[PDB]
Every structure is written in C-alpha cells, then in structure tokens.
Ligand binder design. Structure first.
Ligand SMILES: [Ca+2]
Ligand SMILES: [Ca+2]
Lengths: 154, 96, 51
C-alpha cells in the first residue's frame, strides 16, 4: 500500500508524438526504461531494505498513472503549426464537467469518447439534447442499416 | 437606464434593482421569470468585481467564465474561491 | 556547539524583508510580479515620521 515514489517524465522519457491508436515506443520497439527520479536524470530510484526483502519474496510492484501532461497544435498568424504554450490541462476539467464518457471494448481495441450533455436545470443552455443511441452513433462513427448500429461489421 | 459607472456590461439601475442574463444580454428582472428557472441578481454598481474573485459581474452572471465552476458561483455576491487541503495517509521510515 | 550545549541561546534578528504589492494591469486582473516594495521603502522612510 506504500507508494515507493512518484516520478514525472524527464527529457529521456518524453514522447514527442502519440497519435490516436498509436503507442510510444511504436509497435515493434522495446519499452522505454524509467530509472531516474530527480529533475535532471542524475539520481536513481532507491528502495528500502524491508521493501527489497518483500520484493525478493515474490511481491510485485504495480504502476499507476495519476495524470498525463501534453500539448496540442494550432495555427499561428502564419500557416505554421505551433505546439508550445498550448496545454491540455486547461481544458481537461472543462471537458470532463459537461460531458458523458462512453467506452467500447471490441476485442482488445478500446475507444474512449466524450459527448456534450445538455443541462436541463439551466434555461440558457442551448446545446442540443441527444439520446444514448444518437450519442453512441456520433462518438464511434457507427453506421445505421436497419434501425441498428454497426461499428464496422459487428 | 443607460448609465454605466463601473463600465461592465450591466447598467447601474439594473444592478440596484435586479437583473437576469438571457441571450447574453442583461434584462430587467420580472417576477414571472422564476417559473422558467431564471434567477434574480443584484450587485455593486460602483465595482467590476463585487465578490473579489478575478471574474467580473457580467462574466459571473452570464456564465461566460470557466465551465467547471459551480452554478452557485454565478451570482455576483458569491466568490468562486477554491479551498484546497492536504491529508496524510501513512508514513514510511527508511533506517539509514 | 560546546557553547550551545552549555546553556547559551541563539538569537534571530531580521535584517530586511522582501515582497511584492498588488496593482491592476490593463485588464481588471491584479498582478503582483515585479512590483517590489524595496523601491518605495527608502522613499517612504525619508519623508515620514514613524508612530
Ligand atoms: Ca454597471
Ligand atoms: Ca458591477
């Protein structure tokens, strides 16, 4: 139950690009190591003696991702994409506060989407109201054939 | 009237008597609005931040500010000021 | 240390303090960065009587 350490990603363990459905390192590459604790990658992560005695007796260390940082891209006065100073942490809470989360497993390929939900206690909220079926159709891009939704063929 | 001393988007008389935000414009409050879910707002007519929080009177009343702040913060007389604390769960001692 | 464990006490004296004050920028937002008090400390002390 003991959190040995919480480490933010230093310059060695920063992914420059992560497309939807992609992976860093890309598929076909070995996992990246995370063995530095300080800010300049000059210190190694230590563990206690009783913790080591636990570790060599079979207990496993679990990893939990508390939060993730990153930038997004937009266009400046020129036609050049700039992704510096733009952050997602400014919009994470605002997106989570007015949206309903929908997930879809489909044989080890997960999709997570957020759909705007209208507040019925606010007379000045003009966002259109959708049912669960319409939200599912919009979020995952599923098509309609005979009144039912198919993702690709399922 | 049309006077505006604090130079927000709400006239002073509306602030003195009462106003509500609809279509992003402040209008005089009528008692018939309460059944539609509207609210009656009154605030200082010589200030732009009645509660002291960074958002002004028009921003708070109209909800044009951040969408993750509660609805109760939308009236000008309540401050949208977070209260953050820290709670310890357990302590680990590593003898040297 | 030998003095300290024989009963003598360490006294703490504040020679000076630093800090910023708040002012309004072009918008209605209070900014307190770069607005130091050490610029006005001497000017205030030179023309005022302390009570
Ligand atoms: Ca006003
Ligand atoms: Ca005002």
């Amino acid at each position: 139950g003991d959190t040995l350490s919480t480490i933010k990603a230093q310059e060695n363990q920063i992914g420059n690009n992560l497309s939807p459905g992609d992976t860093y390192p890309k598929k076909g590459l070995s996992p990246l190591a995370l063995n530095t604790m300080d800010q300049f990658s000059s210190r190694l992560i230590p563990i206690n003696y009783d913790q080591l005695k636990k570790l060599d007796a079979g207990k496993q260390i679990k990893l939990e991702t508390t939060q993730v940082s990153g930038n997004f891209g937009t266009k400046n006065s020129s036609g050049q994409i700039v992704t510096e100073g733009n952050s997602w942490s400014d919009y994470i809470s605002q997106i989570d506060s007015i949206s309903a989360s929908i997930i879809l497993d489909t044989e080890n390929e997960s999709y997570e989407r957020r759909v705007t939900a209208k507040n019925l206690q606010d007379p000045e909220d003009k966002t259109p109201e959708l049912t669960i079926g319409e939200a599912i159709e919009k979020a995952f891009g599923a098509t309609k054939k005979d009144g039912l939704l198919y993702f690709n063929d399922i | 009237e049309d006077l505006d001393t604090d130079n927000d988007n709400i006239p002073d008389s509306y602030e003195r008597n009462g106003y509500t935000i609809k279509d992003l414009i402040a209008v005089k409050w009528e008692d018939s609005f309460a059944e539609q879910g509207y609210k009656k707002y009154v605030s200082n007519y010589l200030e732009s931040n009645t509660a002291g929080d960074p958002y002004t009177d028009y921003e708070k009343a109209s909800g044009s500010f951040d969408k993750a702040i509660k609805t109760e913060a939308r009236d000008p007389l309540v401050a949208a000021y977070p209260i953050v604390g820290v709670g310890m769960e357990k302590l680990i001692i590593s003898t040297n």
